[PDB]
């Protein structure tokens, strides 16, 4: 029932792929209740995600930097990147009491995993 929007479907990193480059995702909370999101990276050695977990207020949009750290050599044109990012969103109706989102995410997940809104963002090279 949560009106949460996660975008985009595919993050596109352009050549040269031996150079650092930042793409951006977005999580928009169009519901009337604050949510919390976490981003899991399938290839953490090559990407840095900021923020990896945070709260989104009603009507707020959080842009997430996905920083590709580059590769040692340019890859083949036919090569198909298999890296993915799982964005998971949950209700966050309890005050964090100063703790971070990651610190509470285990309990929040154990409570609301059935109501989680998830999106798998793919990665392609260009
Ligand atoms: O996502 C956007 O709207 C902004 N994009 C649009 C332009 N993109 C296309 C893409 O994301 O595949 C790069 C480009 O084609 O120059 C810029 C970016 O990638 O940082």
Q: How many Å apart are CA 86 and CA 12, to the nearest integer?
A: 16
Q: How many Å apart are CA 108 and CA 126, to the nearest integer?
A: 37
Q: How many Å apart are CA 33 and CA 58, to the nearest integer?
A: 6
Of 14, 26, 121, 123, the one to substitute when testing ligand 1's pocket (max ligand atoms within 8 A of C-beta) is 14
Topology adopted by domain 4-125: Immunoglobulin-like (2.60.40)
79, 69, 72, 71: which is closest to 126 by C-alpha? 79
Q: How many Å apart are CA 95 and CA 104, to the nearest integer?
A: 10
Q: How many Å apart are CA 24 and CA 11, to the nearest integer?
A: 8
* Atom number in ligand 1 closest to CA 8: 1
Alpha helices in the chain (DSSP H): 101-112
10, 8, 19: which is closest to 68 by C-alpha? 19
Rounded to 10 degrees, what is the CA torsion of 24, 126, 10, 70? -50
Q: How many Å apart are CA 49 and CA 64, to the nearest integer?
A: 7
Q: How many Å apart are CA 36 and CA 52, to the nearest integer?
A: 11
Question: For 98, left (φ over 0), alpha (ψ -120 to 50), or beta?
Answer: left
Span from the CA of 5 to the centroid of ligand 1 (angstroms): 19
Exposure string for 72-84, b = 16+ CB within 10 A, e = fewer: eeeeeeeeebebe
Of 8, 9, 12, the one to substitute when testing ligand 1's pocket (max ligand atoms within 8 A of C-beta) is 12
Q: Which residues pair with 123 in a beta bridge?
A: 11
Tokens of 63: 């842009």
Exposure string for 93-113, b = 16+ CB within 10 A, e = fewer: eeeeeeeebeebbeebeeebe
Domain ranges of the chain: 4-125
């Amino acid at each position: 029932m949560s009106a949460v929007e996660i975008s985009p479907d595919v993050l596109v990193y352009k050549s040269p792929l031996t150079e650092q480059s930042t793409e951006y995702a977005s999580i928009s909370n169009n519901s009337d209740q604050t949510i919390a999101f976490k981003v899991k990276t399938t290839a953490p050695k090559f990407y840095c995600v900021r923020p990896n977990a945070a709260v989104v207020a009603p009507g707020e949009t959080i842009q997430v930097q996905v920083i590709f750290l580059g590769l040692t050599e340019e890859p083949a044109a036919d090569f198909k990147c298999r890296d993915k990012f799982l964005v998971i969103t949950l209700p966050s109706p309890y005050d964090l009491n100063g703790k971070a989102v990651a610190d509470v995410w285990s309990d929040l997940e154990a409570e609301f995993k059935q109501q989680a809104i998830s999106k798998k963002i793919k990665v392609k090279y260009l």
